[PDB]
From a paper:
As a proof of concept, we used this platform to identify both known and novel L- and D-amino acid peptide binders to the well-characterized model target, streptavidin. All peptides bind within or near the biotin binding pocket of streptavidin formed by two surface loops [1/2 (amino acids 22–28) and 3/4 (amino acids 42–52)], and by antiparallel β-sheets involved in an extensive polar interaction network, in which residues Ser88 and Thr90 of β-strand 6 play a major role. The surface loops of streptavidin are flexible: upon biotin binding they undergo a conformational change to form a closed conformation, but to accommodate the peptide ligands, loop 3/4 is dislocated by 13–16 Å from the biotin closed form to adopt a well-defined peptide-specific structure. All eight L- and D-peptides discovered in this work bind to the same pocket of streptavidin in distinctive binding modes suggesting (1) the rich malleability of L- and D-peptides and (2) the ability of streptavidin itself to adjust the flexible loop to accommodate multiple peptides with diverse sequences and conformations.
The peptides FDEWL, LAEYH, and PAWAH were selected as representative sequences from distinct clusters, along with the abundant HPQ motif, as hotspot sequences for the next step of evolution. Instead, Asn2 forms a hydrogen bond with Ser45; the backbone NH of the C-terminal Gly12 forms a hydrogen bond with Asn85. The negatively charged sidechain of Asp5 forms a salt-bridge with Arg84 and contributes to a network of polar interactions with Ser52 and Ser45. Further, Phe4, Trp7, and Leu8 are involved in critical van der Waals interactions with Trp79 and Trp120 from a neighboring streptavidin subunit [Fig. 5(A)]. For example, the substitution plot reveals a clear preference for Asp over Glu at position 5, which can be explained by the multiple polar interactions that the short Asp5 sidechain—but not the longer Glu sidechain—can accommodate. Because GNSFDDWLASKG forms an α-helix, a repeating pattern of conserved residues alternates with non-conserved positions in steps of 2–3 amino acids. With the exception of these flexible loops, streptavidin has a rigid structure, with a root mean square deviation (rmsd) of ~0.5 Å for a superposition of all atoms in the co-crystal structures. The Gdlwqheatwkkq, GGwhdeatwkpG and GNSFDDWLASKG peptides bind with the same N-terminus to C-terminus directionality, opposite to the binding orientation of all other peptides. As the array data would predict, the linear version, NH2-NQpWQ-COOH, exhibited no measurable binding at peptide concentrations of ≤2 mM. The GNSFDDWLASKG L-peptide demonstrated irreversible binding kinetics, making it impossible to determine a Kd value [Supplementary Fig. 4(C)].
Residue numbers in the entry:
A (entry chain C), D (entry chain G), G (entry chain E), H (entry chain I): 1 to 12
B (entry chain B), C (entry chain F), E (entry chain D): 14 to 135
F (entry chain A): 14 to 134
Write the structure that this text describes.
């Protein structure tokens, strides 16, 4: 994983 | 030859999977992480199909709205930049990431940054 | 209703003639001045087709490459922003205009600005 | 005309 | 007359309390809200002390680091813009707000926006 | 130790000659090219004098108005960014260069870009 | 108060 | 010289 994709995932 | 069609990589872990059409269109898929359906998004944009011959780059831009069948971040990024050909070809961009906000929060709606895309992985 | 499809006007004398597809597509024509085919360009972009219901705007973006059958400025603009609904509907944007440059001149490739679009001309 | 469109036209 | 020295207001509820020195210096206090010591910060910047006389605005810029004896947001804003004289004088800016981050989070470090300052509260 | 005071270099051939004061001030000189009096300009700015201790960078910004005793470009640049410490220390910035324009030409007043500064050329 | 000052106040 | 300094020089 990576920071940018983690941000997107956290929005659902 | 435009040199743009193909797979490009940035330092955030993203993959830009682009087709440059004869009519100036950019189309394809943007991946925010590899190996996950939930990380794949539609992109669309435009490029200069008849660039200058003086050594100048090729102007282009595209958009991703961060919504697919699995996720919605209520956000969109635009990349504005230029393709630079050669043995070490690159796409150099500056970008604007806008999230939907209420009117009082509009001041914090838009992130700015820069990314260089390469034909080889970082 | 998305509220985006139709004709929009900025303060620079430009007109944004857009169709918002059910799939998230933005398509249409951007006019940098009225009344002349030489000032009409293709636009393409993306929008959030399922925005939040909590008072937030609708995220979107689009690109125009400044080439048509009459002109080529070897440049492209991307607009990143949000649609805000209601009786005084707006599309509020920030933009990046990149021109193709040599590598030596890349520091001066990109202009930045903002534009507010309205359904009534100023 | 306008300033922006004049700039575009001058590039040919 | 330079016309810059005095109190200016923006649409976010902030106050720019500035002195323009003969030598090009901008100094003073930036208030993010009124009537709160915790909302007052030092600013410093520079302006063109010999602008063009052809109707062009006066280029300028300043910085606030968001630290005082009460608060520290580990962040700084820079405003870059121009002063436009007349009966409805304005300072028109674009700005960059950077927060300290790790290298992996640097993509989300910087917000961008625009603000117009006026001599009467909006 | 803030780590900021000293001479820094960017890829455009510029030098950022800066002093970081105890009270959060940045002062010094910005050189757009080396070995020319006509290329030296005053800078002023601010930095976070008490940054986080969790691995984050140190927020900062500064301005140069492009006027000196030899030249005046009727323009100003602001750099906004962060200092990142260690053996390969850097100041990573994004910048806005605004020129004075008429109102009709304001759409073309402001260039945007990015520059990394390093302690070695 | 206001949104921007509240963001700063929240950061503390 | 360099491009950025040349641009400044050109403005006089």
């Amino acid at each position: 994983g990576n920071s940018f994709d983690d941000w997107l995932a956290s929005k659902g | 030859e435009a040199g743009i069609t193909g797979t490009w990589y940035n330092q955030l872990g993203s993959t830009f999977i682009v087709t440059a059409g004869a009519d100036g269109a950019l189309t394809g898929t943007y991946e925010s992480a590899v190996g996950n359906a939930e990380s794949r998004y539609v992109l669309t944009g435009r490029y200069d199909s008849a660039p200058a011959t003086d050594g100048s780059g090729t102007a282009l831009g595209w958009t991703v709205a961060w919504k697919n069948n699995y996720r919605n971040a209520h956000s969109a990024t635009t990349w504005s930049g230029q393709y630079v050909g050669g043995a070490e070809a690159r796409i150099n961009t500056q970008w604007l990431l806008t999230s939907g906000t209420t009117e009082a929060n509009a001041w914090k709606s838009t992130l700015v940054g820069h990314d260089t895309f390469t034909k080889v992985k970082p």
